[PDB]
């Protein structure tokens, strides 16, 4: 009996001391590559990557010998089952290298793709800052439309054949691992089994996502109605009062966040502005000040101040034309106590809150670092993207902004300030939900089947018109690939983490405000000085994967599933007001109206 527990415990205590450096050496080659796209780095990255995967196959093979049914300690059953799963090794070596070329080419096309001026081919725009400044600030419909379609025609059209191959190979790999498809592979992070009474299943995730979204559509239809009703002032001949919105007039290149619509849709413009972008520029803040102010929030709730290696090794400012670095913000744990952020910041409220969010990934990465190697990962994908966004819910408040000097000390917390704040939050948090659900529904179907090759773009744009209420400026045919033109689609990440975190952030926020002994409306709770609220969180961050997400949630907020009630109870003071504003105008949209045909 006990021999096949001690044999397994001995084996994992070989793996945890042998794996740890191969993973570090691999990670440190990827950091040197992403901080300058150069062939000398790509060689090292491929060499250290091969060493890691070639090792993993041997340890996986040794782990295969032990009976999965004999180990009884839960954490060793989890920690061993991660080695017994094959992963990519099910493909032939040529076919596996074929897939690794596809991923590296798609990644390089995204991170180096560009558009150029039609009169002046000497002048070319990268996405950051070039096209981002156009889509964030231009009020010329024609320039916005050009910037919007040129990225989709010039780079989205290149990725179509690669994304076809990626869909084919990843499905065959996932199916030889006994999942139904590669969508099912991704839904597998939410699965809990073996612990009875706390179980969860890869099918049920679809039920709970589609069941919670039904209870969010009413807030969205009212917010969409209000935004549409006001954009007609800015783009008068282009927008229907009863149609879906033109995609390029949303506050972003994809419409992932509506934040930059705020200046066009702010309710009470006569008060001091809640968007502190101008006040930060006026006081001449900078990259380091933004991350220093981010660090002050986490330490004032009693979590650790940053590792010195963070401040010395991180890339917090754009390196410029000297280096072709990636500029999509990322939080890196290399292993062996080494944590870094790569982020091309500039003075903005968006980058101030995003500095809180990516630093929130580092705090969770510092907390579970005591766990053994294969459990030293977040409790669920959604918790990892929620732990940062709990701090932005708190740090964005006019109450907090006055306390750090980005608002004047005479600022008044009146009943128009409360709606000027919630309308800002609703653009980010509710504007992103239908997009985030809809994009992943498309991928789940594309991997599963029920969307054939000659209907990829057909069903995508039908779903954007039907679910999200957004419409294309001019038709795209099946030579294009619009989804591939977004980082998370291009670079092989599950998107549903951004839906489930958007529910978990309010569940945790309510339960932290009670630890801070707060009373009054939830939407002016600052946890910022409560060490008690920080401890209520920290004692769940230190777990890693060691207890199932259902139980790790249930211990902190008293529910064993994602719940919509705290989201709605946050926005209710806005929702009542939007219902008042929309009483004289159409709520919802026709799917038949067209920017090209009408």
């Amino acid at each position: 009996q006990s021999t096949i527990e001690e044999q397994v415990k001995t084996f994992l205590d070989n793996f945890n001391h042998k794996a740890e450096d191969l993973f570090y050496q691999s990670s440190l080659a990827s950091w040197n590559y992403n901080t300058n796209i150069t062939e000398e780095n790509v060689q090292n990255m491929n060499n250290a990557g091969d060493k890691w995967s070639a090792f993993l196959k041997e340890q996986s093979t040794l782990a295969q010998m032990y009976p999965l049914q004999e180990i009884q300690n839960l954490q060793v059953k989890l920690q061993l089952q991660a080695l017994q799963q094959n992963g990519s090794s099910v493909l032939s070596e040529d076919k596996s290298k074929r897939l690794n070329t596809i991923l590296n080419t798609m990644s390089t096309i995204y991170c180096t793709g560009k558009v150029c001026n039609p009169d002046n081919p000497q002048e070319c725009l990268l996405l950051e800052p070039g096209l981002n400044e156009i889509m964030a600030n231009s009020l010329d419909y024609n320039e916005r439309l050009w910037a919007w379609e040129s990225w989709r025609s010039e780079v989205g059209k290149q990725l179509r054949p690669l994304y076809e191959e990626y869909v084919v190979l990843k499905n065959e790999m996932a199916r030889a691992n006994h999942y139904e498809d590669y969508g099912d592979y991704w839904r597998g992070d939410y699965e809990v089994n073996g612990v009875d009474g706390y179980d969860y299943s890869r099918g049920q995730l679809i039920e709970d996502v589609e069941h919670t979204f039904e209870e969010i559509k009413p807030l969205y239809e009212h917010l969409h109605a209000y935004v549409r009703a006001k954009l007609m002032n800015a783009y008068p001949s282009y927008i229907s009062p009863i149609g879906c919105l033109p995609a390029h007039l949303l506050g972003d290149m994809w419409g992932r966040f509506w934040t930059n619509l705020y200046s066009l849709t702010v309710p009470f413009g006569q008060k001091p502005n809640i968007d502190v972008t101008d006040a930060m520029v006026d006081q001449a803040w900078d990259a380091q000040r933004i991350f220093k102010e981010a660090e002050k929030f986490f330490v004032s709730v009693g979590l650790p101040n940053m590792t010195q290696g963070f401040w010395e090794n991180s890339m917090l400012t754009d390196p410029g034309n000297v280096q072709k670095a990636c500029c999509h913000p990322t939080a890196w744990d290399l292993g062996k106590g080494d944590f870094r952020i790569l982020m091309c910041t500039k003075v903005t409220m968006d980058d101030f809150l995003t500095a809180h969010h990516e630093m929130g990934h580092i705090q969770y990465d510092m907390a579970y670092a005591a766990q053994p190697f294969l459990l030293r990962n977040g409790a669920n994908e959604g918790f990892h993207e929620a732990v940062g966004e709990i701090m932005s819910l708190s740090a964005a408040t006019p109450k907090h902004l006055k306390s750090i000097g980005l608002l004047s000390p005479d600022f008044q917390e009146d009943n128009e300030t409360e709606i000027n704040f919630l309308l800002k939050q609703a653009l980010t948090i509710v504007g992103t939900l239908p997009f985030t659900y809809m994009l992943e529904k498309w991928r789940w179907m594309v991997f599963k089947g029920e969307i054939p090759k000659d209907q990829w773009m057909k069903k995508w744009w039908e779903m954007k018109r039907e679910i999200v209420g957004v419409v294309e400026p001019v038709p795209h045919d099946e030579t294009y690939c619009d989804p591939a033109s977004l980082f998370h689609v291009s670079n092989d990440y599950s998107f549903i983490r951004y839906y489930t975190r958007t529910l978990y952030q309010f569940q945790f926020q309510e339960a932290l405000c009670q630890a801070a002994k707060h009373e009054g409306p939830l939407h002016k709770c600052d946890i910022s000085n409560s060490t008690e609220a920080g401890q209520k969180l920290f004692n769940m961050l230190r777990l890693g994967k060691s207890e199932p997400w259902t139980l790790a949630l249930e211990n902190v907020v008293g529910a064993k599933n994602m719940n919509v009630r705290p989201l709605l109870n946050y926005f209710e003071p806005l929702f009542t007001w939007l219902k008042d504003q929309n009483k004289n105008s159409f709520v919802g949209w026709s799917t038949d109206w067209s920017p090209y045909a009408d």
């Binding site: 021999t3 001690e6 044999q7 001995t10 084996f11 205590d13 070989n14 001391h17 042998k18 450096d21 570090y24 050496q25 440190l28 040794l62 010998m65 590792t307 010195q308 290696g309 090794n313 290399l334 062996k336 106590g337 080494d338 944590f339």
Partner: protein, 196 residues
């Protein structure tokens, strides 16, 4: 009028010992100015057990062993009497009634280099705990089950020791700390070491 001990030849030796096979120096027939070590600015740990650290320049002893080695800064909390974990259990054990001092400092500028150091080893499996002050410099393959191991690594058959891998950018809990453990002895006979 004085004659100081060769502490320099330990506290600033070029190359330290791999913890599984730690170095030992005897000190005898000499005066040791411990107050200089106590008033050192570089030392991160100076915990003394059974003896008060300011007091050592008053004492006289028969013999003193200075044991030296290098380990991850996070494992320095296993160099104390009564501890457990893979340094204390299997590489270097102090007794439950130790009298002595443990001295340690960060050395990332010296014991760590780009690409990774990979010199310093530690023992990771053993068939029983060490007795205090024992050493086990051996490389016979540990057997985790009922199959005879035949002196070859494989299924259930693990090599007994593993390298550290210090690169310069690893965090504080994985940087190389040099450690020196002083283990004074009074042996119902003459003193040969004193404070001045």
């Amino acid at each position: 009028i004085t004659n100081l001990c060769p502490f320099g030849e330990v506290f600033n030796a070029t190359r330290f010992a791999s913890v599984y096979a730690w170095n030992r120096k005897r000190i005898s027939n000499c005066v040791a100015d411990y107050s200089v070590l106590y008033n050192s600015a570089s030392f991160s740990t100076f915990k003394c057990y059974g003896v008060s650290p300011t007091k050592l320049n008053d004492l006289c002893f028969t013999n003193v062993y200075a044991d030296s080695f290098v380990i991850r800064g996070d494992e320095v909390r296993q160099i104390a009497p009564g501890q457990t974990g893979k340094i204390a259990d299997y590489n270097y054990k102090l007794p439950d009634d130790f009298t002595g001092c443990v001295i340690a400092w960060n050395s990332n500028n010296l014991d760590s280099k780009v690409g990774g150091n990979y010199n310093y080893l530690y023992r990771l499996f053993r068939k029983s705990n060490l007795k205090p002050f024992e050493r086990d410099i051996s490389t016979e393959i540990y057997q985790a089950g009922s199959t005879p191991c035949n002196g070859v690594e494989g299924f259930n058959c693990y090599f007994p020791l593993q390298s550290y891998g210090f690169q310069p950018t690893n965090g504080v809990g994985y940087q190389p700390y040099r450690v020196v453990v002083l283990s004074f002895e009074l042996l119902h006979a003459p003193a040969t070491v004193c404070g001045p």
